[PDB]
Design a protein around this nucleic acid. Sequence first.
DNA 1: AGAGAACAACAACAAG
DNA 2: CTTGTTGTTGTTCTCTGGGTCACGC
DNA 3: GCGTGAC
DNA 4: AGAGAACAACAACAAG
DNA 5: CTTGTTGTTGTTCTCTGGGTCACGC
DNA 6: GCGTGAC
Lengths: 483, 483
Amino acid sequence: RELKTVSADCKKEAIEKCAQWVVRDCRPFSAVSGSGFIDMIKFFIKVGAEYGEHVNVEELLPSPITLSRKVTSDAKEKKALISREIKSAVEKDGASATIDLWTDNYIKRNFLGVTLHYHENNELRDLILGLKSLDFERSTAENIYKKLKAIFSQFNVEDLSSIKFVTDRGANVVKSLANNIRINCSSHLLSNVLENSFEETPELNMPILACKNIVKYFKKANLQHRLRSSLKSECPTRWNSTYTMLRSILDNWESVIQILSEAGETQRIVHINKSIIQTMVNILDGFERIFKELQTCSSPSLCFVVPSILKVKEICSPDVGDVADIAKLKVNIIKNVRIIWEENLSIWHYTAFFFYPPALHMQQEKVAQIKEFCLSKMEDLELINRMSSFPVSPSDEFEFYRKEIVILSEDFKVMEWWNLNSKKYPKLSKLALSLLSIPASSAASERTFSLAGNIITEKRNRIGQQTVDSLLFLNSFYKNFCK
Amino acid sequence: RELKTVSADCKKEAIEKCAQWVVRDCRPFSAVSGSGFIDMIKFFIKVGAEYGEHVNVEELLPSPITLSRKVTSDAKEKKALISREIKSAVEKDGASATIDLWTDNYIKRNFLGVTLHYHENNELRDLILGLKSLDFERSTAENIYKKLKAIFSQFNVEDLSSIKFVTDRGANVVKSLANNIRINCSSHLLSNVLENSFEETPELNMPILACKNIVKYFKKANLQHRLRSSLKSECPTRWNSTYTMLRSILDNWESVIQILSEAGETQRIVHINKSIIQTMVNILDGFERIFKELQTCSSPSLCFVVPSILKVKEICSPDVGDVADIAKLKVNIIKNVRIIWEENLSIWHYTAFFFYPPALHMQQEKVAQIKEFCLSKMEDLELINRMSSFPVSPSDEFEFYRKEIVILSEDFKVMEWWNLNSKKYPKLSKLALSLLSIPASSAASERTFSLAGNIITEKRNRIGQQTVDSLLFLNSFYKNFCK
DNA sequence: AGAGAACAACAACAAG
DNA sequence: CTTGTTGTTGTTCTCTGGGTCACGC
DNA sequence: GCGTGAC
DNA sequence: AGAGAACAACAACAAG
DNA sequence: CTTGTTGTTGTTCTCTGGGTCACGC
DNA sequence: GCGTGAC
Ligand SMILES: [Ca+2]
Ligand SMILES: [Ca+2]
C-alpha cells in the first residue's frame, strides 16, 4: 500500500533520461503527464522487479505493427463486451445519439460519425460508437442509414424505434433519419439565427469588413509580432467566429492603430466606428456563453434550450439609447429566433424544461401538451419493465410534480436533484433523466472529428478506416468505463 | 551479459499495455520502435529491479515543464562540451557549413539555420549548429552575419576566415557571406537550369498545362479514390516537381482516361500527346538521380558536381530521331548549363574532382589551375600544424598523384580510399578529405527546417525560439556522437 | 465544450 | 539574506463545426 | 427541368 | 537525401 | 493438413526547398 | 528613382 520514493539521485536520472526520449523521437513534452503513459511505466518497473536490470527489451517491446493489430483486435472484443450494456439502455428509451458527416483533410474520405449519450444512474456517458468511411459513395441519405445500421450491427442493436437522434438540418442526414426520432441541433440553429441576421442587417457590413481588412493586413505584412493577443480571422464556417474576430480587434485597439500609423496605411482603421464595434461584442458576448452552454455533453443541455431563447430576447430588448443599425440588429435577431429557432423546436425541448424544478415560467398553453406527451412515454417505459420478468397513477403524478417549488441556489443542479427524488417518483424520474441525457447539439459528434483530425496527420496519413474507428472508440471507452 | 527473455504470458501483457498507451495519449504506433524510447524503458525496468513493484511514479515521473527546462539547460552544456571538438576542425580548414533562411508555418518567425559538416577520420558529421529567430527583423545581410556569429559565439569560434560556406544565390545570404568562402549550392543551380529551360521552351507548355489541369480535376472531384498511385501536383517551389507530376500521370495513364470518360470530361485528356510526355520523363528521370546524388551529406557530393554536368550534356546529345520541341528542350538545357551552372562554379568544384582517382577526364586547362590552388592551401594547413607545438616537397606531390590509376569497381569509394592512402601522402590527403567533406548543396540546412516543421505543429505551436534551437541540436547531437 | 501543448508569472522550498 | 532547482496556477495558441445532397416549383 | 436551402 | 508513419503482401512458425 | 499469431521485406504517403531583400541602370 | 533576379 505505502508507495516508495526514489532517491533524489535516482530522479535526476529519470529527468535526464526522459529528456533523451523527447529529443530523439520528437515527442511532445506532455507525453510524460499523459494518463495512458503513466500506467505503462508502472508495468515496466513491475517487470524489472520480477526479472531484473538485465532483460532483452527489443524482444520484449512489440513492433508497431503488432500494436496496430492489437488495437484492431482489442477493439472488436470491447464492442462485444459493451454489447449488453449498450443494448440495455437503448431498449429502456434512455438512449441519445448524435450523428454528423465529415471528410478528412488528407485522403478526403467521406466519413460518418455517431456518438451515444445515455444515463446509467448518477452520471452520463458520451462515447464514440464509430467513425466509418463511405469509401467514395454518393453520401445519400440511403447510404447513411445503411452505415448507421452497420455500426449498430456491431453492438447487435437493430430496431429503428427506441433511440433519440439529434442532428443538424443537412438534407442528407435529415432524410436518413425520417423514420424515427430526430432533434434539430440547437447549435446549428443558433448559428443560423445569428448568421442570417447580419446578412439581413448589411448596414453593419462596413464596420465588419474594415475589421476583416485590418486582420488580413497584419497577417500579410508579417505583423502581429506583438499586442500579446492575436487578431482572429472571420472564417464564417466556425461558430460565432464574428465575435471572436471583433473582440480580438477591440482588446488590442490601442496598439493596432499605432502599428497602422507607421505603415501609412491608417486609412484601413479611421473609418471604423469604435462605439459600434464595442456595442456588438457586448451583445455578442451573451451569445458566446449560450454557445458554450449548449455544447455540454458532460451535463444536461437540452433542458437549457428554451431558457436561452428568452435570454436572447432580453439581451435584444429595445433601448431608446441604442444607436440605429443596432436596433435593426436587435429586430432581426428576435425576428429570426421565431421563424428559425422556435419554428424548429419540438416537444422534447419543452419537456426537458418541464423537468427543471423552477419551471413556473410557462404555465400557459405548453402545460397541456406536456401532459399528453409524458403520459404516453411513461406507460411506454412501463411496457419495457414488464417485459423484464425472467396506486399513485400516471396522471396523479403529473399534477403532483407541478406544485414543487425549488429556489435556485448555485448548488442546485437538476442532475442529482432527481437522484435524491426518484424514490418518491419511480415511474416518472426515470423518464426525466432519459430526457436530460439528450445533448441538444452535434458538438459531441463534432469533437469526434477533431480527435479524428489529431490521429490522421501529415505523417500518419497512411492510416485507413477501421484503424481510426478503433483508435477513437478505445480512447473513448478508456475515459468512460475506466476510472 | 546474457540478457533475459520474458515469459510469453509476460509479453502478452506488454502488447496490451502498450496498446493502452497509444489510444489514450493519441501517440503514433512507431513510438515503441523509436531508439530514444527504447533506451528509456531499459531505465524503468532498472529502477523496478532495485526498488520493486511499489513505487510512486507520479512523483518519479517529471512534469513536462521540468522536461522543457532540462532540454534547455542540457543543450547549453552540450554546446560547451563540443566547443573544443568543433573549434579543432574549423581551425584545421576542414570545416564546411550550410546556411539558409526559413520561416515557420504558424508564428511566421523569420529563422536562420546553420549546419556544419566536417571530417573526423573515417566518417563525416552533419549536425545542427542552431536555428535562431530574427524576431521580426529586416532580414538584411547585416543581421544574418550578426546571428551567424551569435551561433558561433556559443561554441566560442570567432574568426571569419577558416570555414567554407555553401549556400544558394539569394541576395541576403550571398552578401552576408561576402567576406569569406562561399560556394553556390548545386541543387538550386540545377533547379535554376531546369526551370529556366522550360520557361524558354513554351512550345511544351500545352502538354504540361493539360496535365496540371488533369491533376486539378481529380483533386476537385474527390477523385483519386483509386489507381493505387496518386497524381502529384505542380507546386513549382519543390525541386524537380515537374517530373514527379508527369510520371504520376504516366504510370496511371490506363486508369485516368477511363475515369475521364464516365465524367464526359475526356476533353481534358485527348489533346495530350503521350509520345511526348513519355520522352520528357525519360530525360527527366536522369535528373532525378542527379538531384538525389547531390543532396548527400552522408558521403562526398561536391566531387560529383562536374561529373553530373557531363551526364546532363550527354542525356541531351541531339538525336535525329528526337521529335521537335524536344530538341529545342535539349538545346535550352545545355545552353543554360553553361551560363548558369558552369558560370557559377568555383575552383573548389574541380579540386574536389581532382581528388577522385579516375580524374583523367580533364587533363586540359584545369590542371594548372588546381596546381596553383592546392599548392597554397597545403602550406596553409601546414601553417596550422606548426602552431600545434605545445624531403618529398609540396610540388613533388602534385605530379606524384597525377599518375595514379584506379579502375572503378562498385566497391571503389573515394571516401575510404584516402584512409588507406594517407600514410604515403600525409600533407596532401588531409587537404583531400577537407574538400570531400563539403556538401555542395543546401539540402542539409533544408532538412533542418523539415525537422523544425515537425516539432512546431498545430498543437505545439506555442513553442518559442530556443526550445526549438535546443530540440534540434540535441536530436542531431544524439545521432552524431552517440552510437 | 472537450482535447492537445507550451509557456509567463509566479509560489513553495532548498543550498548557499 | 541572496541565489537556484522544482511545482503551481493561469493564459495563450490550436482543432470539429465540410466542398454537395434533397425538395419544390 | 433548375433554383434555393441547408451544409 | 534524411526523417516520420502506416500498411499489403508476404514468410517463418505455432497450435490445431 | 488446415488455421492463426508473429515478424519480415517492400511500397506508399508525407515534410525542407519561403512571401521579400540586394544590385544596376 | 524602379525593374530584374534571385528567392
Ligand atoms: Ca453536417
Ligand atoms: Ca534561401
